[PDB]
Scaffold this active site. Structure first.
Site, PDB file in Angstrom:
ATOM      1  N   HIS B 254      -0.161   0.041   5.144  1.00  0.00           N
ATOM      2  CA  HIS B 254      -1.576  -0.157   4.885  1.00  0.00           C
ATOM      3  C   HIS B 254      -1.927  -1.613   4.597  1.00  0.00           C
ATOM      4  CE1 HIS B 254      -5.544   0.216   3.002  1.00  0.00           C
ATOM      5  NE2 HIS B 254      -5.646   1.325   3.710  1.00  0.00           N
ATOM      6  N   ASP B 310      -4.067   8.952   6.081  1.00  0.00           N
ATOM      7  CA  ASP B 310      -3.980   9.542   7.421  1.00  0.00           C
ATOM      8  C   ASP B 310      -2.775  10.461   7.569  1.00  0.00           C
ATOM      9  OD1 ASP B 310      -4.959   6.364   8.907  1.00  0.00           O
ATOM     10  OD2 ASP B 310      -6.222   8.005   8.147  1.00  0.00           O
TER      11      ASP B 310
END
Lengths: 373, 373
Positions: B254, B310
């Protein structure tokens, strides 16, 4: 630690497409003078210049304007949209939606982004003209592949071929609007494009920003001003009244130009020609405008504010048979070529545009139950 | 003289809405911990928090979720659009167009931008669910004003009221997506908004950017990965094979978090609950995912890359009855609340966002005639 809100004076790309010298009143597309382009070129050739970065030879241009007439037709769904839709809709919102629909109806994913660009560019005038007729209770009159871009635009508006001064004027007018200084709408395009979303998406963002009221240019309040100044005998009290309690003079001033707008200088000749060939209420408007230009330059010129393209573009658009709320959308027809170009240029070395935001709040607040609130 | 292309490390606003500590793995909405909000709040209350900057008292929230059920209904034109449209269209493009149409059908111009915001926010799920049914050859099943936001979403998808774990999961899932770090799509919104174009325009730009493939998050390639890893006996060769010829692990890493994503940590409990309550091919997927989480954290964790939202959100969306190409659009349902908030916040002190571009070309080129070319 310095918040650059507005992004005024931050550079978000290098470019080779358009150069403006606001100091000298100069404007170049791919290093070519807008004066020369206005005088010696046309919309099709200038579009190729701007998309591809050089003047086309006869075979390249022939290919180019071939694509441009080939794809002017709108699919039935969006045409269905046009005649079925609320007819008191803003033409910009029509344009936004139609381009969005065009995206849905497009299923070629193997297509070069410039080819996709050509076809989009070619349909804008078809969307615009078709809506204008439908809105006025007339019928869609289809694009004539035989005609050139600017002539066909006026064709689909009138239903008949325009005389040659009108289509010249249209052509030069669109040329003058293809691209200009980095702005909200071109940048909105680039933000979407930099995520590699589809072209239609990017262009929808462009239109969505361009119709914003706070956006430089696309003003056309100038026509309104000429209208409310009744005679051109009336103009000096009107303007001097405006200046004394410091109110703007529509069609004057510019964020970059500190001189007469080169686009305004070029467009003035056609405003004048069209007006004096019409001879009507619209010739008297032009007479108003010269009077305003005269006294406007006198009082404001020494502060480096002069007439800009909007000052004449709204007389022209008017003479050419458009209604005032279509003006921005005709703008868009031109500018979308610029948008496509910049996207093409930006994504050779793409960088997704994701700025930061500075949090100036608190954290670690205790969640208080709703009755205790 | 320094081109800041990408606008990485440029601040375009101050904010009070969302704070992320990527170092500590912390996330706050209006200074409230997402853990506490997930656990103690709901979509409606969290939306109010984020739009208005404080938790509502009983009367304020009661007003707020009143507006939210009041305006879930789509006008006939856009419903006509939905059932008439190409059914192999991208749900994002459906959403983009529908929001654009919503703008046309809206004629209240006296309306506070937050009220306009509520109604928009409330219709996203109606657009999404309606298209999903129509696409599957079923029929529009209308919003039930009696139900709460998240329950009604699943209602309009299934045709029946969802069991309570499913609607909890939906609710917390949407909460986790309302807002996050400044990005292309939130910023695309702001660019349009900063010209004071209409809300619908701004949101169209938001969606147009969000569906971009290059956009962080909204990935859902993770579900695909779990699928192609057949058994969870198979997972270690798969992942180790991937790492050895350096290929990404979907749902890991991320841009901001250097720890386990707090949203992923929260969402994992519902991925697990839903999966084990389904028991099917979808429970085995979850078993895959834990195995991947385990070995993934082992090899990648020491480089500070961990699972992100996700990683579980795609199992959940799946369990909840959505098809994978609807995932981004359900994302959008949540995030549009964030978009509206930022626009509200940005335009208290509006500054139109117009960056500069640096011209690195030539000027003064001589216009050469086409035969001489």
């Amino acid at each position: 630690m310095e918040i650059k809100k507005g992004l005024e004076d931050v550079y978000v790309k290098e470019t080779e497409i358009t150069y403006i010298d606001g100091e000298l009143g100069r404007l170049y597309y791919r290093g070519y003078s807008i004066y020369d382009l206005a005088e010696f070129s046309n919309f099709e050739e200038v579009s190729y210049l701007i998309l591809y970065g050089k003047l086309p030879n006869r075979e390249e241009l022939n290919w180019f304007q071939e694509k441009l007439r080939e794809e002017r037709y709108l699919p039935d769904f969006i045409i269905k949209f046009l005649r079925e839709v609320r007819k008191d809709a803003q033409p910009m919102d029509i344009l936004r939606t139609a381009v969005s629909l065009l995206g849905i109806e497009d299923s070629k994913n193997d297509e070069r982004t410039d080819i996709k660009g050509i076809k989009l560019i070619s349909k804008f005038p078809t969307i615009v003209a078709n809506y204008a007729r439908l809105r006025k209770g007339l019928d869609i009159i289809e694009p004539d592949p035989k005609l050139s871009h600017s002539e066909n635009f006026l064709y689909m508006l009138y239903g008949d071929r325009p005389n040659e001064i009108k289509s010249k004027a249209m052509d030069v007018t669109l040329i003058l609007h293809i691209d200009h200084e980095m702005n909200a709408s071109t940048f909105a395009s680039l933000v979407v494009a930099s995520t590699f979303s589809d072209l239609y998406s990017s262009i929808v963002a462009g239109i969505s920003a361009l119709k914003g009221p706070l956006h430089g240019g696309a003003n056309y309040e100038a026509l309104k001003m000429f209208k409310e100044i009744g005679s051109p005998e009336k103009v000096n009290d009107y303007i001097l009244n405006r200046l004394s309690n410091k109110q703007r003079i529509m069609g004057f001033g510019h964020r970059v130009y500190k001189t007469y707008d080169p686009r305004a200088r070029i467009l003035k000749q056609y405003a004048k020609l069209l007006a004096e060939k019409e001879g009507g209420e619209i010739y008297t408007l032009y007479q108003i405008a010269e009077k305003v230009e005269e006294i406007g330059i006198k009082y404001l010129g020494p502060k480096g504010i002069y007439p800009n393209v909007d000052f004449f573009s709204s007389i022209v658009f008017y003479s050419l048979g458009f209604e005032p709320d279509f003006f921005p959308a005709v703008f868009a027809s031109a500018r979308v070529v610029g948008w496509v170009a910049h996207i093409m240029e930006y994504i050779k070395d793409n960088k997704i545009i994701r700025p930061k935001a500075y949090y100036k709040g608190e954290i670690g607040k205790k969640y208080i139950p709703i009755d205790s609130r």
